[PDB]
């Protein structure tokens, strides 16, 4: 059965770029889909999206869509040291936290700074 690692190199493989908001994007539907023992489905679902000619990146969108786990799901909270430890490409993605962000509204999650700062990554 697919892993959660093997599914997160998969979907790496495709994009472009290194610790991009579409990186991390991989890793909480990678996570998200563990804990709900759905890899499965997201991935037929991301190959199925491939093969109709799509671009990567909108494949990983039509799964926050498509697949019933992410359908007005929120954001995973992740708690950080710094802002520093958030990946270079996804710095100028980061946001305020709007009122109340959903996933398959483009927010990826959420990171908790120490010091109770907060920000949103945004595609
Ligand atoms: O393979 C699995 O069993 C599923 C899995 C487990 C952990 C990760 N993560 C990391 O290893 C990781 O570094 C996560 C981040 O989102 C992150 C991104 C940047 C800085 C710090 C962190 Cl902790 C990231 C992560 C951690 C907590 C909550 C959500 C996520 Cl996506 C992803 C998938």
Same mark, same amino acid.
């Given at each position: 059965?697919?892993?959660?690692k093997? !599914?997160?190199?998969?979907?790496?493989?495709?994009?472009?770029?290194?610790?991009?908001?579409?990186?991390?994007?991989?890793?909480?539907? @990678? =996570? !998200?889909? =563990?804990?709900?023992?759905? %890899?499965?489905?997201?991935?037929?679902? +991301?190959?199925?999206? %491939?093969?109709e000619?799509?671009?990567?990146?909108?494949? !990983?969108?039509?799964?926050?869509?498509?697949?019933?786990? +992410?359908?007005?799901?929120?954001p995973?909270?992740?708690?950080?040291?710094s802002?520093?430890?958030?990946?270079?490409? @996804? #710095? =100028?993605?980061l946001?305020?936290?709007?009122?109340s962000?959903?996933?398959?509204?483009?927010?990826?999650?959420? +990171? #908790? !700074?120490?010091?109770? =700062?907060?920000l949103?990554?945004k595609?």
């Amino acid at each position: 059965d697919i892993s959660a690692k093997d !599914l997160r190199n998969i979907m790496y493989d495709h994009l472009p770029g290194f610790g991009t908001a579409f990186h991390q994007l991989v890793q909480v539907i @990678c =996570k !998200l889909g =563990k804990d709900s023992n759905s %890899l499965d489905i997201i991935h037929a679902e +991301f190959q199925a999206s %491939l093969a109709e000619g799509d671009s990567p990146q909108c494949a !990983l969108i039509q799964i926050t869509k498509r697949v019933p786990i +992410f359908q007005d799901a929120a954001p995973p909270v992740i708690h950080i040291r710094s802002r520093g430890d958030i990946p270079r490409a @996804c #710095q =100028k993605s980061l946001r305020p936290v709007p009122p109340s962000p959903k996933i398959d509204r483009g927010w990826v999650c959420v +990171f #908790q !700074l120490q010091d109770g =700062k907060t920000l949103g990554l945004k595609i």
